[PDB]
Design a protein around this ligand. Structure first.
Ligand SMILES: Nc1ncnc2c1ncn2[C@@H]1O[C@H](COP(=O)(O)OP(=O)(O)O)[C@@H](O)[C@H]1O
Lengths: 274, 97, 251, 97
């Protein structure tokens, strides 16, 4: 089972003859490519909706609204910035400082990712982005500790920078321009962050995706398969979400159940044929 | 309206430089921030040891100086302006023109 | 001196409202403006201000309406969001406080049992009017559903079963009117018929127990509520008639 | 633009970080050692002790020295460079090349 027609069919069949769902899945599977992820959430309005996010985007927002560049949309745009990846929460600006001075002379903006950025550092950073000393932005790392630390290396290798690990012999005070990651663009809003056209080698990317495929067969199903493939999608493919429309919650349960059924079934068709 | 320091004590006004300037060109700072330097307005008689004599205060007046801000220094405000009172023992160094 | 209006973050957003309204500037600790240093121009201006145990009041802003209306318009982008009406009450509250006004209706009653029911009817009427304003209105007395049902008489489906389903729905749209009539202890068949005999907004006035034009008699159903009621009814009843089995705990 | 420290105090710049190989046995590490050595920028007149007048410090300039840093040493930034200000008593011995 290959062509989007057939996929749409097994989708339609498993969905109890709802063609819309069948077409939606074939379409989604076409858009996010193989390895791309497809999930389904309860929809706000009565009509079915397919959302698609291509490339590397994670769900965290700018820590201060003052970071905003190019408003409106309350968005922050950084053209060819440097990405900074830190394993630890950032309290003081002292430990922070040298690399930032190195980038200000560099001519380029800077993006920050860590456990969190505490007050003293945010304040200093905001005032500096305001005075027009440096264009900078900061967002939290994507997940819970093991999840986020795991995704930091993904984002790192994607952008070709190196994560600063207090738990190895890199301390944040000593940091180099080469420790930084690079990207074509980054866009941040109150909700989501996006890394556009990272400069990391295609070699490294397929290396880490391959390294994640060994994690794919891991004995723990459901979410582990779900959230891991998710990471893969962010590096190579893209992510899609299908929102199920219904008038009432019981109809929502029925339709959404049929939808996940159709989803698993189409995936099954792709894998094992029909 | 002019206050004269006695013995080892000197009175200087800090220059408000908006701290750092860290550590190079050019950054601002939020916490751990305050003027560490200032110009000397007036000077006391001198130290008294053994009563060999009162050996004055190696720090002349209208000098630009670097100092340490301890508990020893206290700030008082004369007409229209706040200034600080400290002992030469608290003074670290002097900048030359 | 008074505390700022809301809970912390929303309120922090509301401080900017007060600021731009009075032509003053908010002192934001998290920026390179310091709490100690501020000038007479940093202050906002007002015609008069009045404070009591309950509320604080500004009798007017001295700031130009260009910037202000700029902010009333720009808050509208914040009006639509995942928070539905939770944000809308205090946000439209904000917009109103800057531009419009706030209103409160006190419902009178003799006793608590009258009070509750009366206020319930009042809140009902409020929702109903908002719906009317928003989506418009159609002729009341359940004459709407029956009127559209008459237009759908030629609608048919894929197979005979679906045909019967359609006919079932169209029959069920007569229900509201027949029930209204029935609560008067009068023939629903007769009134529903003599209404189906009529055209346009011709319907039955249940209070006067006589026929006539509904819109002219000022009997109005907000389109939103008729639309929603029908949609929601069909949603659950549709699923409910597909039941071939039921599983539950033991008695 | 040379700043002169007064009395027993001298001003020194911190020396390098990490760890040597020391014959090859030693390699970079988490355990940190922070500037136990430095090069002296400038020196004062001397100490004054109970009519023992001005005793010229035994430490020349551009000497490489080891010191123990307490609160007695203070960190200040001159010419956008980080430097330390300390008393000669706080200075330990001096190494020869
Ligand atoms: N005087 C009247 N004559 C005929 N129909 C009326 C009259 N008053 C109200 N109605 C109709 O009855 C319905 C009111 O139902 P109500 O008892 O308020 O419960 P609900 O609003 O929840 O249906 C409205 O659809 C309205 O069109």
């Amino acid at each position: 089972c290959s062509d989007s027609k057939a996929i749409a069919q097994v989708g339609t069949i498993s969905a109890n003859s709802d063609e819309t769902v069948g077409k939606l899945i074939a379409e989604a599977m076409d858009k996010v490519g193989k390895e791309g992820v497809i999930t389904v959430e309860d929809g706000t309005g009565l009509q079915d909706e397919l959302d698609v996010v291509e490339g590397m985007q994670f769900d965290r927002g700018y820590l201060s609204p003052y970071f905003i560049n190019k408003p409106e949309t309350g968005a922050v745009e950084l053209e060819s910035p440097f990405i900074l990846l830190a394993d630890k929460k950032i309290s003081n600006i002292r430990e922070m400082l040298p690399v930032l001075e190195a980038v200000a002379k560099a001519g380029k903006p800077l993006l920050i990712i860590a456990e969190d950025v505490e007050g003293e550092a945010l304040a200093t950073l905001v005032v500096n982005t305001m005075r027009g000393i440096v264009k900078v932005a900061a967002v939290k790392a994507p997940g819970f500790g093991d999840r986020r630390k795991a995704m930091l290396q993904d984002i790192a290798t994607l952008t070709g920078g190196t994560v600063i690990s207090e738990e190895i012999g890199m301390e944040l005070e000593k940091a180099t321009l080469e420790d930084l990651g690079q990207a074509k663009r980054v866009v941040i809003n109150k909700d989501t962050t996006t890394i556009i056209d990272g400069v990391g080698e295609e070699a490294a990317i397929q290396g880490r995706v391959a390294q994640i495929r060994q994690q794919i067969e891991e004995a723990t199903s459901d979410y582990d398969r779900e959230k891991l493939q998710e990471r893969v999608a962010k590096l190579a493919g893209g992510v899609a979400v299908i929102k199920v429309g219904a008038a009432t919650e019981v109809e929502m349960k029925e339709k959404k159940a049929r939808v996940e059924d159709a989803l698993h079934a189409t995936r099954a068709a792709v894998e094992e044929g029909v | 309206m002019n206050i004269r320091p006695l013995h080892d004590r000197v009175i200087v006004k800090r220059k408000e430089v908006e701290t750092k300037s860290a550590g190079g060109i050019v950054l601002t700072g939020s916490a751990a921030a305050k003027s560490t330097r200032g110009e000397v307005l007036a000077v006391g008689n001198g130290r008294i040891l053994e009563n060999g004599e009162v050996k004055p205060l190696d720090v002349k007046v209208g000098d630009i100086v670097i100092f340490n801000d301890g508990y020893g220094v206290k700030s008082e405000k004369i007409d229209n302006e706040e200034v600080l009172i400290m002992s030469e023992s608290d003074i670290l160094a002097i900048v030359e023109a | 001196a008074v505390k700022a209006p809301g809970f912390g973050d929303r309120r922090k957003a509301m401080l900017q409202d007060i600021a731009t309204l009075t032509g003053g500037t908010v002192i934001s600790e998290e920026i390179g403006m310091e709490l100690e240093k501020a000038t007479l121009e940093d202050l906002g201006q007002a015609k008069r201000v009045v404070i009591n145990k309950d509320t604080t009041t500004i009798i007017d802003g001295v700031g130009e309406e260009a910037a202000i209306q700029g902010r009333v318009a720009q808050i509208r982008q914040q009006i639509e969001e995942a928070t539905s009406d939770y944000d809308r009450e205090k946000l439209q509250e904000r917009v109103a406080k800057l531009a419009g006004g706030v209103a409160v209706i006190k419902v009178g009653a003799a006793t608590e049992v009258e009070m509750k029911e009366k206020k319930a009817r009042v809140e009902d009427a409020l929702h109903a009017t908002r719906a009317a304003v928003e989506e418009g209105v159609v002729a009341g007395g359940g004459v709407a559903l029956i009127r559209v049902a008459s237009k759908l008489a030629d609608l048919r489906g894929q197979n005979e079963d679906q045909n019967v389903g359609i006919k079932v729905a169209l029959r069920a749209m007569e229900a509201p009117l027949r029930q209204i009539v029935l609560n008067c202890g009068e023939e629903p068949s007769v009134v529903a018929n003599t209404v189906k005999g009529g055209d346009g907004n011709y319907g039955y006035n249940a209070a006067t127990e006589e026929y006539g034009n509904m819109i002219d008699m000022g009997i109005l159903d907000p389109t939103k509520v008729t639309r929603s009621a029908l949609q929601y009814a069909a949603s659950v009843a549709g699923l409910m008639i597909t039941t071939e089995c039921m599983v539950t705990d033991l008695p």
